[PDB]
Amino acid sequence: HDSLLDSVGQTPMVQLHQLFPKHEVFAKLEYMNPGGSMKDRPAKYIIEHGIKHGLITENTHLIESTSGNLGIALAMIAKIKGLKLTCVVDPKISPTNLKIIKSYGANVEMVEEPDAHGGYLMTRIAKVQELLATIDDAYWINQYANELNWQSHYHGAGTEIVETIKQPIDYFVAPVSTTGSIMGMSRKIKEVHPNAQIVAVDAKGSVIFGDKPINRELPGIGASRVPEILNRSEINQVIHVDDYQSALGCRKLIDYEGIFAGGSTGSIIAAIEQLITSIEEGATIVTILPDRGDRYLDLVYSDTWLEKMKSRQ
């Protein structure tokens, strides 16, 4: 490979035999991408597209609002391409992920005022618009509305999944924030497996699917606005999980399978444990594990954080 860019994708798939002994449950390890998450795929895809089409030159200042993983992916790619980048972030970001963005030489704008229900997305978007107003040659990645987001997953893990799974897929389960992953992957999966059931896993208190908004702790799952790239008619079921439940799911996965994953992976485990009680034995379930446990030592893998979240419920 001529660079790191060439090592994005083609991630491993494993079966979770120990955790789910009566079902065929397969997990795509997207956290093994070089930047450390699934978001490596939309970052590569959007930036290469923009350069090809004259939207992004060496003078273009990239801007994005992120809970952490897309900021890290964008900063890696920007280093390789010689581009400037400013990440707009909020106080809920993983402290580890905030320091990583800075080590990659990205500019950081940290907002401080949440809305009436604890969410910082409205304030992040406003900060982005302010940066756009004062930076002459700037390009907003705009992941909640950019069609290239779900397209990158259609061609990425979505395609790899249907190339690799040698049996009918009964359920596809994915966590949501922009819904790029689940829209893109499900669209590819259903071309081959048209009766596959599509299950979104979301945070309790996320308005994506119409919950009453409430303050959420874990970054990366859930949102306080409805993403524009979501098409609700393509989702068959929604399951909501809270911060405490997601943390328990992380800790059970590492105990049962030796897999050390981030918060939204815990949300997926907790949701699949709720789902399988209804599912015929032997059925095939496919999911994705978006990022690494490494980044959540002050959150999910902190016993005092765990105890704090248990009190909240």
Enumerate the known binding-site residues for pyridoxal 5'-phosphate. Answer: 69, 177-181, 264
Residue 21: CB atoms within 10 A of its CB come to: 9
| Pairing, β 13-15 against β 24-28 | antiparallel
Size of the site for ligand P1T (CB under 6 A): 20
| Pairing, β 84-89 against β 24-28 | unpaired
Rule CB under 6 A: is residue 199 a binding residue for ligand P1T?
no
Rule CB under 6 A: is residue 220 a binding residue for ligand P1T?
yes
Distances (CA, A) of 126 to 109, 121, 166, 251: 12, 9, 46, 36
Rule CB under 8 A: is residue 22 a binding residue for a copy of itself?
no
Looking at the DSSP bridge assignments, the partners of residue 198 are 172
Distances (CA, A) of 97 to 93, 134, 138: 7, 27, 24
Nearer to a copy of itself, 128 or 289 (CB): 289
Nearer to a copy of itself, 46 or 100 (CB): 100
Among 21, 194, 210, 258, binds a copy of itself (CB under 8 A): 258
Rule CB under 6 A: is residue 189 a binding residue for ligand P1T?
no
Least distance (Å) between residue 227 CB and ligand P1T: 8
Nearer to a copy of itself, 15 or 236 (CB): 15
Rule CB under 6 A: is residue 291 a binding residue for ligand P1T?
yes
Burial category of 268 from C-beta neighbours within 10 Å (exposed 0-12, middle 13-18, buried 19 and up): buried
Least distance (Å) between residue 1 CB and a copy of itself: 5
Nearer to ligand P1T, 60 or 146 (CB): 146
Cβ atoms 300, 217 nearer than 8 A: no
- Span 88-147, contacts to a copy of itself by CB under 8 A: 96, 99-100, 103-105
Residue 210, Ramachandran bin (φ over 0: left; ψ between -120 and 50: alpha; else beta): left
Rule CB under 6 A: is residue 181 a binding residue for ligand P1T?
yes
Least distance (Å) between residue 38 CB and ligand P1T: 7
Cβ atoms 132, 65 nearer than 8 A: no
Contacting residues toward a copy of itself, per CB under 8 A: 1-4, 6-7, 12-15, 17, 29, 32, 34, 36, 76-80, 96, 99-100, 103-105, 254-255, 257-260, 292-295, 297, 301
